Symmetry: C2
Subunit: 157 residues, 2 copies
């Protein structure tokens, strides 16, 4: 088991895809006007938490990918990253809060699944995913509350 | 080497994240009005091309993920899939064409890298990414020609 830099930089580069979704956001008065739970962090917290988790999940996948029988784990990981990349555009871009809520739940389930598979192969890779899963749970709660506490128009069918 | 239905259905399900980008953002009226290159294919072509490629890439990844030392190849697979998911919301959603070109070029590099890495472990998995790399090369040209042939629109530059 090593710090393998070809693996870790490949997974890190991969997190460049969700990274662009967040960067390409402007200040948005639609989001500024939303009612929000008291525990909603300020917007500057999110790039730093997401950045940290990009490093933690890339370090976790890096370990797992040096181990035998890791295919199912890395299938869960590919699915996790892909629905994570899809959420931000759906919520902030298209402003479809219901559809984004379905998305972040499919994400949460694949994050939990990865973490679990990771735990069957490597406790540290599993442990590295725990703050991801927590952050994903809060993200689900935030999307859910944005929809509970606000007016939603109908989405394009 | 087998038909692993859990592996395959996981990779296919991960393809649900990109498949969702098209469903929510079908080619726009704004997209119709862009000047297109002469070889631009009709509009029914793209849903059947992407749908085939999700089955083909999921099948390829399923073979590879059963093999030993497939970590790096699976790492490339997560990388291409994420940049794939990111591309449609950048080009069709935000209409930021120049950023989209960067995105689809990075995607192309990671599709080439997955293919190459698939060939090192399983010849069939490599063969099945061949039409993907071909199609990603066509996607890249379309994105380039969309900017080239619509350079007077601010969203192209
Ligand atoms: C430009 C304006 C930016 C805003 C409003 C911002 C704020 C946000 N970023 C979010 C997600 C995010 N923040 C993120 C990394 C970055 N974000 C960045 C720029 C921004 N980050 C930069 C730069 C990043 C990398 C260096 C990413 C990548 C997401 C999308 C979640 C994900 O896919 O990782 C969310 C949704 C909550 C969550 O992640 O749970 C908010 C409110
Ligand atoms: C904002 C947080 C997101 C951060 C965004 C990423 C930033 C870091 C960039 C590094 C990419 C480098 C690419 C690394 C790919 C290396 C491929 C390689 O090593 O291949 C070896 C293989 O064994 C034979 O091909
Ligand atoms: C909820 C509790 C966990 C979530 C808290 C989120 C904060 C960040 C935590 C990271 C854990 C790992 C930190 C230390 C890194 C592990 C050490 C490592 O793995 O290197 C050892 C190697 O095996 C040679 O001995
Ligand atoms: C177009 C994108 C959308 C595509 C939709 C994605 C498909 C999801 C399937 C759900 C049913 C779940 C059934 C999964 C069956 C598990 C198979 C199983 O456990 O078999 C053991 C395995 O073969 C060990 O080698
Ligand atoms: C419209 C499309 C957008 C949303 C589509 C999302 C699809 C929903 C989730 C599918 C899970 C399918 C997972 C099938 C594989 C899981 C089985 C498994 O985990 O098996 C593990 C075991 O250890 C190995 O034998
Ligand atoms: C590190 C991995 C390598 C991949 C990284 C990808 C970055 C490339 C970015 C390109 C942006 C656009 C630059 C080229 C713009 C051509 C469009 C153009 O302007 O067309 C000519 C003119 O407009 C007609 O009148
Ligand atoms: C939501 C934000 C909360 C999370 C914020 C985290 C900030 C960084 C803190 C933890 C450092 C963890 C260090 C991880 C180092 C483990 C990588 C590694 O050492 O892997 C084993 C190595 O290859 C030899 O065996
Ligand atoms: C099924 C998977 C979705 C489950 C996702 C977990 C949803 C939990 C939402 C949540 O716990 O948010 C905090 C709560 O709203 C604070 O009072
Ligand atoms: C083999 C995997 C398929 C991907 C190939 C992408 C390359 C171009 C696709 C279409 C033209 C190829 C000939 C297709 C012949 C079938 C005729 C057809 O389906 O036409 C649809 C109908 O016209 C709707 O209006
Ligand atoms: C504009 C650029 C267009 C061209 C794009 C080029 C980039 C693709 C890279 C190499 C392809 C070769 C992939 C396979 C490399 C050797 C594989 C090998 O070992 O054999 C494979 C097979 O399993 C038994 O021979």
């Amino acid at each position: 088991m090593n710090m393998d830099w070809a693996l870790f930089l490949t997974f890190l580069a991969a997190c460049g895809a969700p990274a662009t979704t967040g960067a390409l956001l402007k200040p948005d008065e639609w989001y500024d006007n939303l009612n929000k739970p008291w525990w909603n962090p300020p917007r500057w917290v999110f790039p730093l938490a997401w950045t940290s988790l990009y490093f933690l999940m890339s370090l976790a996948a890096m370990r797992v990918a040096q181990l035998e029988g890791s295919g199912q784990a890395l299938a869960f990981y590919a699915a996790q990253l892909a629905f994570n990349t899809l959420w931000t555009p759906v919520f902030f871009g298209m402003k479809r809060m219901a559809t984004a809520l379905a998305v972040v739940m499919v994400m949460w389930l694949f994050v939990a699944a990865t973490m679990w598979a990771f735990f069957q192969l490597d406790t540290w890779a599993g442990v590295l995913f725990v703050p991801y899963l927590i952050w994903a749970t809060a993200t689900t709660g935030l999307n859910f509350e944005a929809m509970r506490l606000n007016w939603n128009r109908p989405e394009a069918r």
